[PDB]
Amino acid sequence: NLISEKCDILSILRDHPENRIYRRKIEELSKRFTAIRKTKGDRNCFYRALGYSYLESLLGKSREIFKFKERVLQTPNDLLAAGFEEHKFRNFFNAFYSVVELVEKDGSVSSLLKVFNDQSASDHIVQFLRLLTSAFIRNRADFFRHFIDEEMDIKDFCTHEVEPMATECDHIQITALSQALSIALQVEYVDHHVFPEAATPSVYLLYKTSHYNILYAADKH
């Protein structure tokens, strides 16, 4: 499946024999986190992980859901301001928005996970999040241009490394999407620019070999 059920932290070792060199780190994670979900490794897992994990965190939080829904409703304007024609992002927006309404009206983890495990609806959701990232980059080109070579074109970067499905993310894309959606994200690293520890993150991800899974904090008891 695209997004797994919750499993033990220590399952990162017991499975995967490659992972035994990082046993002490995995054991320290096991004291701060209580679970991990696995995402398929298809070059889209940053977008799929962040989008699932963030929408999961909103379940049952009326006022957070309210404010997120209002931001997502403004997203067509970011897209249009970036140069995308309504014609082209429409179906991706609709699919994203329909998961936000599931969150708001259904409110259940199992229905959410069912959308994110449906290849088609889930890839639309990814493609939305990618176009949003690209829009955000392009509308803030004066900032994001400092992250690539001064003779490279930020627009090429969006066209080739952000918009197409199955292009791996890197720090630019993670910074752009998180800022676009106002997500407080903490990335943990099992073993080129680290992400900071967050105050009260809604999403924790575990990074290893350019792949992202989702962590759940035992910030508790």
From Swiss-Prot:
- Protein task: Hydrolase that can remove conjugated ubiquitin from proteins in vitro and may therefore play an important regulatory role at the level of protein turnover by preventing degradation. Mediates deubiquitination of 'Lys-11'-,'Lys-48'- and 'Lys-63'-linked polyubiquitin chains, with a preference for 'Lys-63'-linked polyubiquitin chains.
Q: Which CDD domains match?
A: OTUB2
Any matching Pfam family = Peptidase_C65
Its Enzyme Commission number(s) read 3.4.19.12
Q: What is the effect of changing N213A?
A: Abolishes deubiquitinase activity
Question: Which InterPro entries does the annotation name?
Answer: OTU_dom (IPR003323), Otubain (IPR016615), Papain-like_cys_pep_sf (IPR038765), Peptidase_C65_otubain (IPR019400), Peptidase_C65_otubain_sub1 (IPR042468), Peptidase_C65_otubain_sub2 (IPR042467)
Tell me the active site.
D42, C45 (nucleophile), H211
Record GO cellular component, one term? nucleus
Q: What is this protein called?
A: Ubiquitin thioesterase OTUB2
User: What family classification does the UniProt entry report for this protein?
Assistant: Belongs to the peptidase C65 family.
Catalysed conversion reaction: Thiol-dependent hydrolysis of ester, thioester, amide, peptide and isopeptide bonds formed by the C-terminal Gly of ubiquitin (a 76-residue protein attached to proteins as an intracellular targeting signal)
Which residues carry the site feature described as Required to orient and stabilize the active site H-224? Answer: N213
Domain OTU, first and last residues per copy: 34-218
Q: Name one GO biological process term.
A: protein K11-linked deubiquitination
- Where does the entry say this protein is expressed, by tissue? Widely expressed. Expressed at higher level in brain.
- What extra comment accompanies this record? In the structure described by PubMed:15258613, the Asp-42 active site of the catalytic triad is located too far to interact directly with the active site His-211. A possible explanation is that OTUB2 is in inactive conformation in absence of ubiquitin and a conformation change may move Asp-42 in the proximity of His-211 in presence of ubiquitin substrate.
Stretches assigned to coiled coil = none
MF terms from GO for this chain are:
cysteine-type deubiquitinase activity; ubiquitin binding
Arranged from A to Z, the UniProt key words for this protein are:
Hydrolase, Protease, Thiol protease, Ubl conjugation pathway
Phenotype upon changing C45S: Loss of function in vitro
